Design a protein around this ligand. Structure first.
Ligand SMILES: Nc1ncnc2c1ncn2[C@@H]1O[C@H](COP(=O)(O)OP(=O)(O)OP(=O)(O)O)[C@@H](O)[C@H]1O
Ligand SMILES: Nc1ncnc2c1ncn2[C@@H]1O[C@H](COP(=O)(O)OP(=O)(O)OP(=O)(O)O)[C@@H](O)[C@H]1O
Ligand SMILES: Nc1ncnc2c1ncn2[C@@H]1O[C@H](COP(=O)(O)OP(=O)(O)O)[C@@H](O)[C@H]1O
Ligand SMILES: Nc1ncnc2c1ncn2[C@@H]1O[C@H](COP(=O)(O)OP(=O)(O)O)[C@@H](O)[C@H]1O
Ligand SMILES: Nc1ncnc2c1ncn2[C@@H]1O[C@H](COP(=O)(O)OP(=O)(O)O)[C@@H](O)[C@H]1O
Ligand SMILES: [Mg+2]
Ligand SMILES: [Mg+2]
Ligand SMILES: [Mg+2]
Ligand SMILES: [Zn+2]
Lengths: 240, 188, 39, 206, 102, 395, 69, 92, 101, 191, 93
């Protein structure tokens, strides 16, 4: 029975939340080593004893794998008109820190972690994102806001967690969260699940080591809807 | 279960009288021990004969099979065997030691502080219950008294919350006084 | 504004291999930002 | 044998009991209970439980296996000012409000303690007090003093708390407050700044 | 004393049996089958006990179903919304007609 | 097919007055009821094959039988069914099941243990809809309505005549009006006309209020509307009476609230069932409201509502007819001239005319009389009417 | 009463003033007097800081734009 | 009143309106082998193999029930089962 | 409000002098009225009052006795309660009052 | 291998000395009892415990699990940011020190003079000019928790955030070294 | 439109996603949304939320990443002023 280690505490003991949405304390770790474990790892515990039997490799949901760009749409920057400053900002904030990195550290200047493309509909947000996916070698990870909203409790947070993990696995990876308004609504029981997804997205954004190799792009036609805690300082700052 | 039936078949292969016992440790949480002995019914005998078990005496029909077993297949593929506990002396006198009450507790005087507090509390609640009993007796409403005797049964004032408390108070006081005289006589 | 102009002078320095920012570069950054803030 | 049967009755309630909600009693020795596992059950009531504790909705303890009701568990909500949450404003701390102090006490402290005089005159002591005046004159301070000096449950709400979105939640909160005061009586309800929801009713058009 | 002991013993026995499920009746389907809705398991086509006449199993009634076969064995009081249940006066007010003047 | 489930009613007794002929008619009705009771009581008792097949099917089915939804049909004897908890199971289809009506989305009957499909739940109607069906027809007939001859004619030509005489419409080449709205001042006879229609109709009659069509959960409103109209379609000749349509028929507008938008969604589902993709079928809809100016234009447009039947306040002739109807049972006096009360200024409605009679009877009871008189009637009028006007400006 | 105060301060001087001020204003006056005493590294409250606090709290008009009066 | 009582009594006596169920005509099924397939064939919960593990192991998502690491039975071959497809699994 | 839903509209006008006397005698039944109590004069001293105000007058007349620590009420207590309960609030600004001649 | 898991729950209430009320995380509420050699005082209402899976008895207590909402309300920053980092505001940092140091350092004089509460304070000015660094400059001495709950979770228009969103400020400050609730931009509370 | 508005959270967007996937499996599909104003209401700030999420799912399915394909959408409404400007954008309609 597949389960996750929500925390590891000393007596050598673990608190396991099974896939059946119930958390059990383990008086002993089981058949694996406590040192080679941490919060969040996938472990196959016993059906009834609930004791860890072996560790499991990082598993990605089918939706997360389908989220990766494999067709590589072909859209040159010449196809975008009237946005030369915007294209320059996006390429210098999302692509330039990617394939340069070390020299950005050489100047000791922090490249921003995320980019929020916002504006009226039809202004070219998703077009610019598609062009960026076209003219970059990074592993683009497209998605939408409504995708990270599911019936089951914690399914959206799990989805965004696997998306960000798959982004981490590929060193040059870009995450494009289109239509951020679906999960980025202002804080106000599906509202609880959407809020859990949003806080999971914020936690993933904050958990990045500074100027890491994963950059996040988000698009939105309505910014007044967007939760102000999304912008902040460590998260998406370049409100293009 | 089906797998239980298969392994019981495997056991009967060696000997035709291989009995299976099923124990429920959580259902047998109290003075009730839920245990049962089962042996398979040969499904061929179900039509070749009738029932698998002869009834030559009345020693087998003093029990009543549990609905769980009939739903799971009692008297159709397995049949229950009556459970008899072979308990003897030197195995019963040893188990009477788990609560044996060594001689010290038979002479302990409790402590007089909480004994006095308990006596006072029981006396006060008894004064209230005696007020209630006084009300119940002087009311003596005669509109079919045998009916008011049955319309006011709720384990209340008249007798249950009555002298049962007298019984507790008198027993406690007598035991305490007798123990006090015993220890003032025996010990110097 | 000062933090962003410090960052924007470096951003100007990203073009070409300049590992250091020159006084003309800071001047460009301020004449960009202090006027862009008006919009 | 009777002693053994009493011991078994006691052993019926033997710790690992599931909490349930009492919905309604079908009849004596029987009830409908809502187990906190999320499913309703039709169970049997032990005779030894005192029937007056079976409230229309009360927390009861159910047998783990048989689901039968075997025990009734003992009962802050919105405010329910606790003993450790007293305002600790004494009447001495209030400087010179003798007329207001006496008029307030004669309606909100004397009836709870000296109800005998009200019964002797037979006047149905006043139930409502409206304190009014310029702001900062000592109204809320006097209500705090009453809260600290009273033996009754104190409820403190603001008139602006009642004005909410989600129509039917304002009056719902008013009814919740009054029903809470009803449950643990005697009680005092202090609705400060009620002037928000107190204006003269006119022909509202929205 | 025998009566007391027997009463306690039958109370113990009737306490050992499991609690029966509570479900609303969608409709009676046969003379011996009822389409009930057990919360939250769902809808069941249950059989009726021999002591329950099918004609009293009206739509939207709260029947009790045994723990194992979901057998309809009691008709039970009907379901009332808890907020609507408190609307019925149980203790009459003390105001009388002689307390109204003019 | 599943033809109309018409409401049951006994034959009407004409004499009204407590005479011997009325007693004879009621005794004849009772005699037929006794004959039916005796026949259907001696049937099963006098009664002393298929039993083997029924027993075999019942043992194979077992009890209880869980109700699930059929998701996919894989083979002729295998299918994926989702239990009520949302978990799908790959189960086997037993032979004694029609493969014809086994379609995705249907409510299948599953074994409790093996979960094999053992039957199909045919009706599976939402219990909140099956209550709307009228089983006991109201006793108010068309003879209980005073005046309203034009309104009665329109409502008949819309809902009753098409069923009784479809040949006129077939030869004429016109489809009969399948939607009517009854609007007017309160207490005029809208619900009375709907009750008379249900009493006289031979089609199944579904009565809603327009406030039970609104459900707490998100999708349950439009789903309930669709289920109601599906049930109306199942019994081919059907009449759906949506009283108080103002409740959900209010004009659509941009609302910043989930509740108002969900109610607008419910109304949109209603008018998509009324006239949208796919023909509505032999389902006629009657709607009633006191305020038609507040209704959404799409809801009352032709095609959905074909006849906007007006229900004005009664005039002198209609007032006289209503007084005659509502004083028929009363033991009237000789000096009582109803014409004095019939005059009025302009604002005596049919509902008021009945309360006037009730109040007059009450005043007669006050004087220990069972025969109402003129003074009783005038006192009742000046007691029962509550008013609310321009000043002396116009000449 | 709970404040340290001083022998030289005479509260009757401040009480007799014709200014109409609520009990909240009295509390604010006393709190500002304490703050003024504490700002000058003094553990005693005297007439001067009490007077200045009185004058500060009394000033409640703010702007009033000079023509409403 | 007694006519109303008789009407109620007739309705209660009949009171069946036998609900139609998907029962095939008797000649259509006429099968005692339905018990044979009921006893032999076992129900299978549907689940999608999210991740394959390389004796290969398979991670299955049983909709909302749980995630398990299982192996194929001898009936099917490893080539048939691919990542991401929905498969049937026994309840034990 | 249409007939058939609300068949009878019963109006509750403010009590007249006799009705006010009846309410006074109803709400002072448990009160220890002095010998010189003329409840009719109290009814006359309350023109256009409501039933609740008539009861409030009795309550305040009793509260005066409570203040004086006596169990009997006099006519003076009722007269002062009439004034305390029936105290209205007027315009307080003759400017607004004089808009309408 | 023989070890079995234990369900995790919160002790909601104390029934008696030997009876407890525990709510399983995604289970029902059970009345249970302690094992035996457990300090009953450690089991306050709200603590995390590990019930046995069969007898449901409380077996051991567990630290709480870090809650969501509380990420900027509970983090501690006992750092040392010099006033040189926030440059050009010597007068403002002087005023902030004069306001915060005197009550924190020596409240004995404050209780001596009588005036207990120095609370309040206000730093209106241009937006984003270094308001946070001002409270970060004062972090030179103490000020460990230093919570930032800007325009949220204290009022929420009418009352919505209170008690559990008005009191936990003062609890997690009291159970640690002194800090500054530092609510910010209250001009946008509930909007 | 009723089916796209589901009681459970996230189910309407899921239904839209499977609907567009099924359309993509076929060659030259035609999709008709009658009374699009039922779910295509303008966004606001819980209100519909779930309905707004379904509308956003439909919006990104019509236009955005992952080209829609040979799917011509058909939408009808008698109140076009209440539609979301993003949905009315001439890349989706
Ligand atoms: N500046 C531009 N230059 C060239 N083509 C543009 C530009 N802006 C938009 N377009 C074209 O118009 C359409 C707009 O769709 P696009 O995906 O760019 O929208 P968007 O800005 O992401 O907004 P929305 O999310 O509201 O649909 C596309 O077909 C794109 O090719
Ligand atoms: N024309 C009429 N002839 C006879 N009786 C009438 C007439 N109009 C109304 N009534 C009487 O008035 C009563 C109430 O009127 P009805 O139920 O028809 O109201 P309505 O027109 O539906 O209005 P609302 O829905 O606002 O109550 C009826 O039961 C009926 O007895
Ligand atoms: N008579 C008084 N004696 C002492 N302090 C007072 C007095 N009146 C007012 N205060 C002070 O003024 C403040 C305002 O009191 P409060 O009643 O809360 O305001 P309001 O009167 O506007 O409701 C209180 O904190 C209190 O300390
Ligand atoms: N006609 C009356 N006779 C006697 N007592 C009355 C009368 N009218 C009012 N009262 C008293 O005054 C109070 C009026 O309150 P209530 O009748 O509830 O107000 P409302 O009529 O506005 O609902 C009651 O407590 C009642 O004791
Ligand atoms: N005078 C200053 N010296 C150094 N940094 C500053 C100054 N003014 C603003 N900043 C920068 O601004 C940021 C803080 O902004 P802040 O004033 O907290 O915004 P807000 O007041 O809206 O919270 C810091 O990251 C800091 O680098
Ligand atoms: Mg886009
Ligand atoms: Mg106040
Ligand atoms: Mg009507
Ligand atoms: Zn076994």
């Amino acid at each position: 029975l597949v389960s996750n280690v929500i925390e590891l505490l000393d007596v050598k003991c673990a608190v396991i939340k099974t896939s059946t949405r119930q958390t059990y304390f383990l008086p002993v770790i089981g058949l694996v080593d406590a040192e080679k474990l941490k919060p969040g790892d996938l472990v196959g515990v016993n059906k009834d004893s609930y004791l860890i039997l072996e560790t499991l490799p990082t598993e990605y949901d089918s939706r997360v794998k389908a989220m990766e760009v494999d067709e590589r749409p072909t859209e040159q920057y010449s196809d975008i008109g009237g946005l030369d400053k915007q294209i320059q900002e996006l390429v210098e904030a999302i692509v330039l820190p990617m394939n340069h990195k070390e020299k950005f550290e050489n100047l000791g200047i922090q490249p921003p972690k995320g980019v929020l493309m916002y504006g009226p509909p039809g202004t070219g947000k998703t077009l610019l994102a598609r062009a960026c996916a076209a003219q970059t070698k990074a592993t683009f990870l497209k998605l939408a806001g409504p995708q990270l909203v599911q019936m089951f409790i914690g399914d959206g947070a799990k989805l965004v967690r696997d998306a960000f993990a798959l982004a981490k696995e590929k060193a040059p990876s870009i995450i494009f969260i289109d239509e951020l308004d679906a999960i980025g609504t202002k804080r106000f029981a599906g509202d609880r699940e959407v809020q859990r997804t949003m806080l999971e997205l914020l936690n993933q954004l904050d958990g990045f080591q500074p100027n890491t190799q994963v950059k996040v792009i988000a698009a939105t036609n309505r910014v007044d809807i967007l939760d102000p805690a999304l912008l902040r300082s460590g998260r998406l700052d370049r409100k293009i | 279960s089906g797998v239980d039936i298969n392994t019981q078949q495997s056991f009967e292969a060696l000997s035709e009288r291989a009995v299976a016992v099923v124990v429920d440790p959580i259902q047998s949480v109290k003075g009730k021990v839920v245990i049962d002995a089962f042996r398979l019914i040969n499904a061929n005998m179900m039509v070749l004969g009738h029932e698998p078990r002869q009834t030559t005496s009345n020693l087998g029909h003093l029990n009543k099979p549990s609905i769980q077993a009939l739903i799971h297949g009692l008297n159709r593929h397995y049949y229950s065997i009556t459970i008899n506990y072979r308990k003897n002396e030197l195995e019963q006198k040893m188990l009477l030691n788990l609560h044996k009450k060594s001689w010290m507790e038979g002479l302990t005087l409790q402590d007089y502080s909480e004994h006095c507090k308990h006596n006072e509390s029981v006396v006060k609640e008894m004064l209230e219950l005696a007020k209630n009993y006084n009300k119940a007796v002087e009311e003596e409403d005669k509109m079919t008294p045998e009916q008011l005797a049955i319309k006011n049964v709720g384990k209340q004032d008249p007798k249950r919350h009555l002298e049962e408390h007298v019984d507790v108070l008198m027993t406690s006081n007598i035991v305490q006084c007798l123990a006090a005289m015993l220890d003032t006589v025996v010990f110097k | 504004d000062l933090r962003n102009v410090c960052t924007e002078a470096g951003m100007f320095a990203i073009r070409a291999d300049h590992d250091f920012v020159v006084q003309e570069d800071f001047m460009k950054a301020v004449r960009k930002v202090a006027d862009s803030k008006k919009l | 044998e009777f002693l053994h049967a009493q011991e078994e009755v006691k052993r019926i309630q033997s710790i690992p009991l599931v909490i349930g909600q009492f919905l309604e009693a079908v009849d004596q020795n029987t009830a409908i209970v809502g187990s906190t596992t999320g499913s309703n059950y039709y169970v049997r009531i032990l005779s030894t439980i005192d029937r007056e504790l079976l409230k229309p909705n009360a927390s009861v303890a159910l047998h783990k296996h048989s689901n039968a009701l075997v025990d009734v568990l003992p009962p802050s909500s919105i405010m329910m000012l606790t003993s450790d949450q007293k305002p600790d404003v004494m009447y001495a701390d209030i400087g010179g409000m003798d007329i207001q102090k006496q008029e307030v006490r004669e309606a909100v402290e004397l009836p709870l303690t000296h109800f005998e005089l009200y019964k002797q005159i037979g006047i149905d002591p006043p139930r409502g007090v409206l304190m009014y005046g310029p702001p900062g004159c000592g109204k809320t301070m006097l209500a705090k003093a009453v809260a600290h000096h009273t033996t009754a449950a104190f409820i403190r709400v603001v008139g602006s708390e009642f004005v909410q979105k989600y129509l039917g939640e304002g009056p719902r909160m008013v009814r919740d407050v009054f029903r809470l005061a009803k449950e643990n009586a005697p009680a005092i309800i202090f609705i400060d700044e009620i002037d928000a929801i107190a204006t003269k009713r006119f022909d509202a058009q929205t | 004393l025998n009566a007391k002991v027997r009463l306690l013993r039958e109370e113990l026995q009737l306490l050992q049996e499991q609690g029966s499920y509570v479900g609303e009746v969608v409709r009676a389907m046969d003379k011996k089958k009822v389409l009930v809705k057990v919360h939250p398991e769902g809808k069941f086509v249950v059989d009726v006990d021999k002591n329950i006449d099918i004609n009293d199993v009206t739509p939207n009634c709260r029947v009790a179903l045994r723990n194992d076969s979901y057998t309809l064995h009691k008709i039970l009081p009907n379901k009332v919304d808890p907020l609507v249940s408190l609307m019925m006066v149980e203790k009459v007010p003390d105001s009388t007609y002689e307390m109204i003047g003019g | 097919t599943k033809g109309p489930d018409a409401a049951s009613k006994l034959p009407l007794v004409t004499p009204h007055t407590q005479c011997r002929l009325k007693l004879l008619k009621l005794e004849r009705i009772k005699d037929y009821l006794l004959m039916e009771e005796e026949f259907i009581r001696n049937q099963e008792q006098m009664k002393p094959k298929q039993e083997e097949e029924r027993s075999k099917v019942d043992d194979l089915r077992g009890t209880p039988m869980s109700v699930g939804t059929l998701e996919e049909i894989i083979d002729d004897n295998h299918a994926i069914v989702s239990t009520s908890v949302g978990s799908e199971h790959y189960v086997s289809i037993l032979s004694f099941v029609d493969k014809d009506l086994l379609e995705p989305g249907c409510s299948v009957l599953l074994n409790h243990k093996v979960h094999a499909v053992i039957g199909v739940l045919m009706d599976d109607t939402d219990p909140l809809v099956t209550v709307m069906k009228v089983e006991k027809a109201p006793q108010e007939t068309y003879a209980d309505i005073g005046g309203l001859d034009n309104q009665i004619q329109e409502i008949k030509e819309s809902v009753e005549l098409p069923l009784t005489h479809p040949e006129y419409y077939e030869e004429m080449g016109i489809k009969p009006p399948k939607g009517v709205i009854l609007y007017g001042p309160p207490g005029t006879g809208k619900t009375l006309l709907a009750k008379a229609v249900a009493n006289q109709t031979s089609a199944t009659f579904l009565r809603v209020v327009g406030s039970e069509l609104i459900q707490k959960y998100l999708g349950d409103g439009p789903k309930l509307v669709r289920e109601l109209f599906r049930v109306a379609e199942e019994h081919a000749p059907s009449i759906v009476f949506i009283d108080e349509i103002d409740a959900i028929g209010t004009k659509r507008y941009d609302s910043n609230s989930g509740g108002e938008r969900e109610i607008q969604r419910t109304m949109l589902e209603l008018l998509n069932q009324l006239d949208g993709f796919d023909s509505r079928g032999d389902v006629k809809v009657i709607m009633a409201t006191n305020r038609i100016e507040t209704l959404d234009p799409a809801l009352i447009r032709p095609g959905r509502i074909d006849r906007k039947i007006e229900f004005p306040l009664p005039d002198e002739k209609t007032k006289k007819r209503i007084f005659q109807i509502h004083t028929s049972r009363m033991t009237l006096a000789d000096d009582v001239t109803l014409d004095d009360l019939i005059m009025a200024k302009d604002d005596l409605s049919g509902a008021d005319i009945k309360a006037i009679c009730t109040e007059a009877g009450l005043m007669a009871l006050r004087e220990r009389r069972m025969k109402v008189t003129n003074e009783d009637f005038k006192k009742s009028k000046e007691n029962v009417l509550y008013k609310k006007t321009p000043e002396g400006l116009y000449l | 009463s709970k404040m340290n105060l001083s022998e030289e301060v005479d509260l009757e001087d401040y009480v007799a003033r014709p200014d109409k001020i609520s009990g909240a204003d009295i509390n604010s006056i006393c709190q500002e007097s304490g703050m003024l005493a504490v700002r000058e590294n003094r553990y005693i409250v005297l007439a001067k800081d009490f007077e200045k606090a009185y004058k500060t709290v009394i000033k409640k008009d703010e702007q009033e734009h000079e023509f409403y009066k | 009143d007694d006519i109303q009582q008789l009407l109620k009594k007739i309705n209660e006596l009949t009171g069946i309106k036998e609900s139609d169920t998907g029962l095939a005509p008797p000649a259509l099924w006429d099968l005692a082998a339905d018990k044979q397939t009921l006893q032999s064939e076992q129900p299978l919960q549907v689940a999608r193999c999210t991740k394959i593990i390389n004796d290969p192991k398979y991670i299955i998502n049983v909709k909302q029930f749980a995630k398990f690491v299982v192996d194929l039975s001898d009936q099917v071959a490893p080539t048939d089962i691919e990542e991401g497809m929905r498969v049937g699994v026994d309840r034990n | 409000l249409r007939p058939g839903r609300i068949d009878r509209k019963i109006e509750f006008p403010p009590p007249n002098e006799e009705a006010r006397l009846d309410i006074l005698k109803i709400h002072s039944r448990k009160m220890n009225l002095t010998r010189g109590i003329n409840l009719r004069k109290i009814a006359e001293l309350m023109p256009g009052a409501s039933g609740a105000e008539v009861k409030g007058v009795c309550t305040e007349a009793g509260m005066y006795a409570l203040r004086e620590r006596r169990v009997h009420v006099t006519q003076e207590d009722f007269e002062m309660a009439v004034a305390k309960v029936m105290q209205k609030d007027s315009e307080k600004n003759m400017s607004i009052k004089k808009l309408w001649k | 291998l023989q070890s079995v898991g234990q369900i995790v729950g919160e002790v909601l209430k104390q029934l008696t000395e030997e009876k407890f009320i525990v709510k399983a995380t995604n289970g029902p509420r059970y009345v249970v009892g302690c094992r035996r050699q457990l300090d009953k005082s450690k089991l306050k209402p709200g603590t995390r415990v590990a019930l046995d899976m069969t007898t449901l008895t409380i077996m051991r207590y567990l630290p709480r699990e870090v809650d969501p909402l509380v990420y900027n309300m509970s983090h501690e920053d006992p750092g040392n940011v010099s006033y040189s980092e926030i440059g050009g505001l010597s007068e403002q940092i002087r005023e902030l020190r004069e306001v915060i140091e005197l009550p924190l350092t020596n409240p004995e004089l404050f209780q001596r003079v009588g005036i207990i509460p120095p609370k309040g304070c206000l730093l209106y000015g241009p937006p984003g000019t270094g308001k946070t660094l001002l409270a970060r400059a004062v972090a030179s001495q103490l000020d460990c928790n230093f919570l930032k709950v800007v325009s949220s979770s204290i009022v929420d228009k009418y009352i919505g955030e209170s008690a559990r969103l008005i009191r936990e400020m003062f609890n997690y400050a009291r159970d640690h070294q002194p800090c500054i609730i530092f609510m910010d931009e209250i001009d946008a509370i509930g909007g | 439109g009723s089916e796209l508005v589901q009681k459970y959270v996230g189910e309407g967007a899921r239904m839209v996603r499977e609907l567009f996937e099924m359309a993509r499996t076929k060659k030259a599909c035609l999709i008709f949304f009658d009374e699009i104003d039922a779910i295509g209401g303008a966004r606001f700030d819980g209100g519909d939320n779930e309905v707004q999420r379904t509308m956003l799912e439909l919006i990104n399915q019509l236009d955005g990443f992952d080209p829609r394909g040979n799917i011509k959408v058909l939408m009808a409404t008698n109140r076009p002023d209440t539609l979301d400007p993003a949905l009315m954008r001439p890349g989706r309609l």
